[PDB]
């Protein structure tokens, strides 16, 4: 099956993923030349006082954490979005070396990682209603550069030796999303799709301009954790990013001038 290897990797997704070839294909490079200003745009809300996480979880692919999103707690709302959209996870990107990891790019620059922080419309009831819509999820993608530490992820960073391969989950409650914003809400946006299979092309972009920083510690746990299941071939979960698609008949809006 797929991932991200020589074999199994983004040039092979299209065979059994034909809409990896389509219309509104994620991610892609932000040309900040080109982006609009868009003053109609509102402010992001982001309102994640009552988020719940629940677990952390290595899928194979990343590693994900959990929340609660069977009510209101975490959500993101304004913006370009119509409606409200429920946290249900959030995950990241990231390279083997600190000059690549980033889905998107800026003006062609690769970030060293990228959090997607992954919401889903409540009118269409639950996420695998979402994911058939065009505009059923809303991906908040931040950038992390490597320099100073981010207070913010480092109970992720101490959790990942308990998932450090495929299937392993551990509990990971009481995690404030919140500690991983930079100081800014300014954001790109446009739409897309799923970054990995299905590639479903039923999300809003939103990805904001000022990027994180985590601490080069930091980013070299998140390159111990491994892409197989414990007693399989140990392959580290490095390079785990699609790179930048065609942006084809689509316009990339600014909040901000
Ligand atoms: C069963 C249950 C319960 C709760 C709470 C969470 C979860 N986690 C979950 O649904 N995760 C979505 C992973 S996926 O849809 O299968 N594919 C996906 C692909 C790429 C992106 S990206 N890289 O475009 O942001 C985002 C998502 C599952
Ligand atoms: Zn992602």
């Known amino acids: ?3 991200y290897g020589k074999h199994n990797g983004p040039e092979h997704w299209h065979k059994d993923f034909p809409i990896a070839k389509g219309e509104r294909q994620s991610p892609v490079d932000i040309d900040t030349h080109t982006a609009k200003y868009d003053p109609s745009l509102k402010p992001l809300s ?26 209101d707690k975490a959500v993101l709302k304004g913006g370009p979005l119509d ?50 819509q065009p505009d ?24 990942l030796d308990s998932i450090k391969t495929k299937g392993k989950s551990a509990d990971f409650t009481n995690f ?6 930079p100081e800014s809400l300014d954001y790109w946006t446009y739409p897309g799709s799923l970054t990995t299979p299905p590639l479903l092309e039923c999300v809003t972009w ?3 301009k000022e990027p994180i920083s985590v601490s080069s510690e930091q980013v070299l746990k998140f390159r111990k954790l491994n892409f197989n299941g414990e007693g ?7 390079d785990n990013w699609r790179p930048a698609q065609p942006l084809k008949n689509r316009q990339i809006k600014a909040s901000f001038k």
């Open 206 to 208: 939103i990805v904001l």
């Open 176 to 181: 404030d999303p919140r500690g991983l914003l």
């Open 1 to 3: 099956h797929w991932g």
């Open 136 to 159: 059923g999820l809303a991906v908040l993608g931040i950038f992390l550069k490597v320099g100073s530490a981010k207070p913010g992820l480092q109970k992720v960073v101490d959790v």
């Open 83 to 132: 409606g409200t959209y429920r946290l249900i996870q959030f995950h990241f990107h990231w390279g083997s070396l600190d000059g690549q990891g980033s889905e998107h790019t800026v003006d062609k620059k690769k970030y060293a990682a990228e959090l997607h922080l992954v919401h889903w419309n409540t009118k269409y009831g639950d996420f695998g209603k979402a994911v058939q």
């Open 46 to 71: 982001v309102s994640y006082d009552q988020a719940t996480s629940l677990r952390i979880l290595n899928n194979g692919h990343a590693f994900n954490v959990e929340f609660d999103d069977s009510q």
């Open 232 to 238: 399989e071939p140990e392959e580290l979960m490095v």
